[PDB]
Design a protein around this nucleic acid. Structure first.
Length: 133
DNA sequence: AAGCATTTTCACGCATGAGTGCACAG
DNA sequence: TTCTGTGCACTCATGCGTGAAAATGC
């Protein structure tokens, strides 16, 4: 990414959150009685942004930005993960492909959402450390 | 009887960044 | 041969701030 200047002379990084320092400032200024437009002017942050941050702060008490990107589980869904754990639990010596075949035959997954063996072992590894935590 | 200021909204164009499944290796 | 661990490149459905138009407010 790269920094830029907005119509107010403020530096912003397109697609990224405003620095925590600015976010704290925003709430700090509001707390002392500054209206959103004042905060916008002083901190050279867009009015819409000031509004969103302040709004979310009042609703959640958080100044931290939410998680951008990533993705949601496609094959390793919670029920599938429970099942995988379920299979390993009752037969530790079981192979990933054996676990795959099971998820399929039992109908926990369709040929469209069946995890790759790799993912299955990844799931298994994720569970392993999880219980070490 | 007349407008500018504020605040509210959200389309935009951006940058991801979790989850997945390969090739490769032990 | 099999299997499972590593490292990678890919994917898109997210959330970002901005800018500006639509509401309000004053």
């Amino acid at each position: 990414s790269h920094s830029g200047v907005n119509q107010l002379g403020g530096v912003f990084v397109n697609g990224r959150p405003l620095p925590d320092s600015t976010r704290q400032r925003i709430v700090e200024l509001a707390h002392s009685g500054a209206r959103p437009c004042d905060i916008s002017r002083i901190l050279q942050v867009s009015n819409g942004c000031v509004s969103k941050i302040l709004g979310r702060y009042y609703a959640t008490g958080s100044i931290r930005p939410r998680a951008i990107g990533g993705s949601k589980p496609r094959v390793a869904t919670p029920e599938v993960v429970s099942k995988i754990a379920q299979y390993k639990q009752e037969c530790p010596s079981i192979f990933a492909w054996e676990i795959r075949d099971r998820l399929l035959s039992e109908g926990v997954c369709t040929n469209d959402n069946i995890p790759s063996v790799s993912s299955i072992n990844r799931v298994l590894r994720n569970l392993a450390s999880e219980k070490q935590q």
